[PDB]
Coordinates of N, CA and C in Angstrom, one line a residue:
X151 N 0.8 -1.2 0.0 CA 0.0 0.0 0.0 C 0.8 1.2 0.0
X152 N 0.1 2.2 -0.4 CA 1.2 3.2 -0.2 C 1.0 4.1 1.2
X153 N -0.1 3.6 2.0 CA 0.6 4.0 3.7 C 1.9 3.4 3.9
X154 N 1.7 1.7 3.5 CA 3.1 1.5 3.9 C 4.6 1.9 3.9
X155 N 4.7 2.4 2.3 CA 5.5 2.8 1.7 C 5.7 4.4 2.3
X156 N 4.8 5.4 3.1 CA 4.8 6.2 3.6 C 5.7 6.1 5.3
X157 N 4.9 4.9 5.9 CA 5.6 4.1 6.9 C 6.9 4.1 6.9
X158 N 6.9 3.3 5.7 CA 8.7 3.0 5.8 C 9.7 4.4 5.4
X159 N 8.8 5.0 4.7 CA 10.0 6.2 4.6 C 10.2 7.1 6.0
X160 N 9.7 7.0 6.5 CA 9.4 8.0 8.2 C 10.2 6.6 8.8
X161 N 10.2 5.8 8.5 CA 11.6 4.7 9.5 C 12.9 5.0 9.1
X162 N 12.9 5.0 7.7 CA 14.1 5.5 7.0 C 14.5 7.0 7.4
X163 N 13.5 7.6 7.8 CA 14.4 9.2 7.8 C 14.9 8.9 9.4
X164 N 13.4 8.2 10.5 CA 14.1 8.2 12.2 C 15.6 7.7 11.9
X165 N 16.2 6.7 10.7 CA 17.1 5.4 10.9 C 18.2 6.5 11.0
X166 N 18.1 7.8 9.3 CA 18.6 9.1 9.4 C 19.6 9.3 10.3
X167 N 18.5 10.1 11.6 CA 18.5 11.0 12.0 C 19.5 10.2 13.3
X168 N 18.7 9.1 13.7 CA 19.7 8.0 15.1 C 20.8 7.5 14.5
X169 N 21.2 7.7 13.2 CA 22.5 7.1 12.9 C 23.3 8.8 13.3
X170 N 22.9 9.8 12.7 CA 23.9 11.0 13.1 C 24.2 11.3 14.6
X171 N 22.8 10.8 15.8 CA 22.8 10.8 17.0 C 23.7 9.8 17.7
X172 N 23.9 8.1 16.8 CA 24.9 7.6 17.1 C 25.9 8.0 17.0
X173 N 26.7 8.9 15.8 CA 27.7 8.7 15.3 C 28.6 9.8 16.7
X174 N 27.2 10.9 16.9 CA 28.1 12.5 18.3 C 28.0 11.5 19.1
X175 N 26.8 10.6 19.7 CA 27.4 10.0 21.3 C 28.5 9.1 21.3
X176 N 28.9 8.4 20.2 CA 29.9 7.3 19.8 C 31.5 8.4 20.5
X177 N 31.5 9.7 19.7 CA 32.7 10.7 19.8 C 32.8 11.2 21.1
X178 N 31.8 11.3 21.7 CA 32.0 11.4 22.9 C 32.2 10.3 24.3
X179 N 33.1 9.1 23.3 CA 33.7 7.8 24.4 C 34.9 8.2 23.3
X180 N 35.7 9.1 23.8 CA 37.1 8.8 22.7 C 38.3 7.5 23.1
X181 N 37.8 6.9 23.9 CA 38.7 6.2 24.6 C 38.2 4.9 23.8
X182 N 37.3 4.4 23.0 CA 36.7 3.2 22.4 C 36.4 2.5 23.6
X183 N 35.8 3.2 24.8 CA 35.5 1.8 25.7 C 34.2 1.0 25.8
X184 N 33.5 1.5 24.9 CA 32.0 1.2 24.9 C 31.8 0.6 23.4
X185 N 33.1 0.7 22.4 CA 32.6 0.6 21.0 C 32.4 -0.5 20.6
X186 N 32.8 -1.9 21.7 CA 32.1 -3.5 21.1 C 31.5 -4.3 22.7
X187 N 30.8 -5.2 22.4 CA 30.7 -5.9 23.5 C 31.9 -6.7 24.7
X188 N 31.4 -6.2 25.8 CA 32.2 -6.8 26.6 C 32.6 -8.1 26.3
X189 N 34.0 -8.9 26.0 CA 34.8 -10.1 25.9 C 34.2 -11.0 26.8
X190 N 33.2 -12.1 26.4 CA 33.4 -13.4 27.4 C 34.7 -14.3 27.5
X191 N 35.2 -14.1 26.5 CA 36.2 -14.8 26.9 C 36.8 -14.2 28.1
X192 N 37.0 -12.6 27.8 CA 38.4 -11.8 29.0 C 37.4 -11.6 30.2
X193 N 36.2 -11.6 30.2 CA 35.6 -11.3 31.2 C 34.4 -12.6 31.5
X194 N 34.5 -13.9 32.0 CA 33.9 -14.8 31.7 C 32.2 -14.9 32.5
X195 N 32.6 -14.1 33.7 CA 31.4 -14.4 34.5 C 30.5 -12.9 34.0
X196 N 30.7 -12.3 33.0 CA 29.7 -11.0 33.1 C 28.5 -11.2 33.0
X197 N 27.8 -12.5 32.2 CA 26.7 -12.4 32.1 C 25.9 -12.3 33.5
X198 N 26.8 -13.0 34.5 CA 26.6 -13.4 36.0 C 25.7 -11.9 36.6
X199 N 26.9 -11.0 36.0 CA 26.2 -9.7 36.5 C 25.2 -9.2 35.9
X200 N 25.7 -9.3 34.5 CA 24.8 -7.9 33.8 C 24.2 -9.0 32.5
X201 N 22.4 -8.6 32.7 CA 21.4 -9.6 32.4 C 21.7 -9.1 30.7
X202 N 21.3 -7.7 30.6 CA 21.4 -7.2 28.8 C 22.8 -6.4 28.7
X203 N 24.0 -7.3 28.1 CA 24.6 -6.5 27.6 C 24.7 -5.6 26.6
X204 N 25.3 -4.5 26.5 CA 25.1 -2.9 25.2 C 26.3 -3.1 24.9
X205 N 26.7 -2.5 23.6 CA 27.7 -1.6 23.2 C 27.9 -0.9 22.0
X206 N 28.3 -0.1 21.7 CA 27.8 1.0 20.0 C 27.6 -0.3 18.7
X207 N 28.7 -1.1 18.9 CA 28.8 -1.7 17.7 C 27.4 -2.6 18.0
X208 N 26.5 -3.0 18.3 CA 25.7 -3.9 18.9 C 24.2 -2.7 18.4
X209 N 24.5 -1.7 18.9 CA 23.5 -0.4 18.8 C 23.4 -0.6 16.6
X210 N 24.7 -0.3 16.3 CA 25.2 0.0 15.2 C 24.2 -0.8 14.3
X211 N 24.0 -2.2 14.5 CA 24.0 -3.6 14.0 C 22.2 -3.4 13.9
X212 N 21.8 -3.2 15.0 CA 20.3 -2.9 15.0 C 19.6 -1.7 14.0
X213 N 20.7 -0.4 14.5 CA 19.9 1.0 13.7 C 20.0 0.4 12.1
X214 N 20.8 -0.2 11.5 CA 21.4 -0.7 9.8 C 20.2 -1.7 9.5
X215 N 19.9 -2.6 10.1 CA 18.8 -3.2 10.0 C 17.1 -2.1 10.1
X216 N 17.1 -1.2 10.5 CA 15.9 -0.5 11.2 C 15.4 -0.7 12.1
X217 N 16.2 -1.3 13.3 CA 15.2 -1.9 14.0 C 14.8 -1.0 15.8
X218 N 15.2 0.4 15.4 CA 14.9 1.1 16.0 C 13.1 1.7 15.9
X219 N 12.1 1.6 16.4 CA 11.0 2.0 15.5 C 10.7 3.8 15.9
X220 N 11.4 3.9 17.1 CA 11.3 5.3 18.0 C 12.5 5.7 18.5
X221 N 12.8 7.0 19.1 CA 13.6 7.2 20.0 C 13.9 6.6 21.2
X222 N 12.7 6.4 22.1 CA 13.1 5.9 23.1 C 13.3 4.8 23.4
X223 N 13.2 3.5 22.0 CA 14.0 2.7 22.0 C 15.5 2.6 22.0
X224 N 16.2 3.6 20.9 CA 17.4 4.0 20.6 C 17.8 4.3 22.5
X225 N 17.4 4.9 23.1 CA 17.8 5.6 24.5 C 17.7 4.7 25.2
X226 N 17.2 3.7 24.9 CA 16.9 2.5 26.2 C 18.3 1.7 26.4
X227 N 18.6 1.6 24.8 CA 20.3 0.6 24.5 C 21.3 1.7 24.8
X228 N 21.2 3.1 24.8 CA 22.2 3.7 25.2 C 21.9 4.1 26.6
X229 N 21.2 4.2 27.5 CA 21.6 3.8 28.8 C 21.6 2.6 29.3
X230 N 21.7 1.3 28.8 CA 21.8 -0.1 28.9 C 23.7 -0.1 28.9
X231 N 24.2 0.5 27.8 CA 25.6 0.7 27.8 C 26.1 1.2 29.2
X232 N 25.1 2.2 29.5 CA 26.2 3.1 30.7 C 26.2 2.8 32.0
X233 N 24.3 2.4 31.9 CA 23.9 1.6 33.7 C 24.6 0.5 34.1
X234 N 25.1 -0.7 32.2 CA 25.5 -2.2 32.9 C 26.8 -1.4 33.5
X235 N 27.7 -0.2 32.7 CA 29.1 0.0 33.4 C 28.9 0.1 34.7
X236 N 28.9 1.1 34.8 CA 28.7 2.0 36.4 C 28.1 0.4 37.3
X237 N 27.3 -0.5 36.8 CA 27.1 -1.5 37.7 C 28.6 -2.4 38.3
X238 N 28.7 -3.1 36.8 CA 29.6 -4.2 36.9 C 31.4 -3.2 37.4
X239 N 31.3 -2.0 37.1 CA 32.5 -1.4 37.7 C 32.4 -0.5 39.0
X240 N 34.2 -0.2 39.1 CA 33.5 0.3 40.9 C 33.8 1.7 40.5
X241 N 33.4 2.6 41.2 CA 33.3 4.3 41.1 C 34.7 4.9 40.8
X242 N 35.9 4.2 41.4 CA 37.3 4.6 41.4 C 38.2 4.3 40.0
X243 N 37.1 3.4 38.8 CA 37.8 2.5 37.7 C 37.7 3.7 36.5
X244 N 38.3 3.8 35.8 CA 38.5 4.5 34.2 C 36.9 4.5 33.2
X245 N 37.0 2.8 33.6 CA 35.8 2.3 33.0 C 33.9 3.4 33.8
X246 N 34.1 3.2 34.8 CA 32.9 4.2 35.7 C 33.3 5.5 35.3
X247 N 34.2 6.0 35.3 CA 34.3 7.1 34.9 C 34.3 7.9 33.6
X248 N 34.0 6.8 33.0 CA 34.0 7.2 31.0 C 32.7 6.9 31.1
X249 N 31.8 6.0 31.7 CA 30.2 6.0 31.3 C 29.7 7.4 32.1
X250 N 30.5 7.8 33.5 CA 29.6 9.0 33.5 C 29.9 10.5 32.8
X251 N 31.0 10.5 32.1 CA 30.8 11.4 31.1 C 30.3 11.2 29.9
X252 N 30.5 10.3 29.3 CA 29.2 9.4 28.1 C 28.0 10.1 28.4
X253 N 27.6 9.8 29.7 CA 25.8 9.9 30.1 C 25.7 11.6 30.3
X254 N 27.0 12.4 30.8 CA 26.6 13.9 30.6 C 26.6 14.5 29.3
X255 N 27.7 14.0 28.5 CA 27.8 14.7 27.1 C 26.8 14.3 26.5
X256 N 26.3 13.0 26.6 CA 25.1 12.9 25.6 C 23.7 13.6 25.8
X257 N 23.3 13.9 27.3 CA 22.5 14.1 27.8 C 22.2 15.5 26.8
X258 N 23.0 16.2 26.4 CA 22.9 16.9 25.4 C 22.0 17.2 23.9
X259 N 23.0 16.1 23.4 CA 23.0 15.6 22.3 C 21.3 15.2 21.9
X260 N 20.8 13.9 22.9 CA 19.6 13.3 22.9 C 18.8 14.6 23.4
X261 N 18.6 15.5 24.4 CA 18.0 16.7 24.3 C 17.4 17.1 23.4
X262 N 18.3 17.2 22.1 CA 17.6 18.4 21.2 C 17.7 17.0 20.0
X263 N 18.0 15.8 19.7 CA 17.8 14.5 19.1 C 15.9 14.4 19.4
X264 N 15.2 14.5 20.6 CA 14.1 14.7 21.1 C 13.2 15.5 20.5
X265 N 13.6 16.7 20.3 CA 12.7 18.2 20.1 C 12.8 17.7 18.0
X266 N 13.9 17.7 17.8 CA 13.7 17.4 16.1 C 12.9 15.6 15.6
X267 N 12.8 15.0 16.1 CA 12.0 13.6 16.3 C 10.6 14.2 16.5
X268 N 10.2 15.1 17.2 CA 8.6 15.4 17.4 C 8.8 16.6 16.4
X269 N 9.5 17.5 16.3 CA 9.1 18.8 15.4 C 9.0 17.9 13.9
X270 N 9.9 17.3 13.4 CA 10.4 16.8 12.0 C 9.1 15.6 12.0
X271 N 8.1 15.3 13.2 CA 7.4 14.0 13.2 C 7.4 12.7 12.9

């Protein structure tokens, strides 16, 4: 039908708009510490701790497919990245300390990611 075809193009522009939204939160981990999934090999018991693991490249894999259908799905996997850190690390580690500047710089970013999602529709 051509609703559908209407559909899909409004998926295709959100896919757009969360791929440019990935690309500023991604720049703001300049350290690559969030940019693949945590190593079961190097880290064997994590699932122990952390039930959903995140990481950009994992984010990446989903938006390419479309399988974002809204924003606040997109925001759920990127604080999924920052909550499992700050869990499975302790407050004094590199690692806690790069998810909580992650979660300030982006806090930004997704701000006004928000206002163009409802203005743009």
């Amino acid at each position: 039908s051509m609703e559908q075809v209407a559909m899909e193009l409004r998926l295709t522009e959100l896919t757009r708009l969360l791929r440019s939204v990935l690309d500023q939160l991604q720049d703001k981990d300049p350290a690559r510490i969030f940019a693949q999934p945590v190593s079961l090999k190097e880290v064997p018991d994590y699932l122990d701790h952390i039930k959903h693991p995140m990481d950009f490249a994992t984010m990446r894999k989903r938006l390419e497919a479309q399988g974002y259908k809204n924003l606040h799905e997109f925001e759920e996997d990127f604080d999924l990245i920052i909550d499992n850190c700050m869990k499975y690390n302790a407050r004094d580690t590199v690692f806690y300390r790069a998810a909580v500047r992650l979660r300030d710089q982006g806090g930004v970013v997704l701000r006004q990611a928000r206002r163009e999602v409802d203005s743009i529709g």
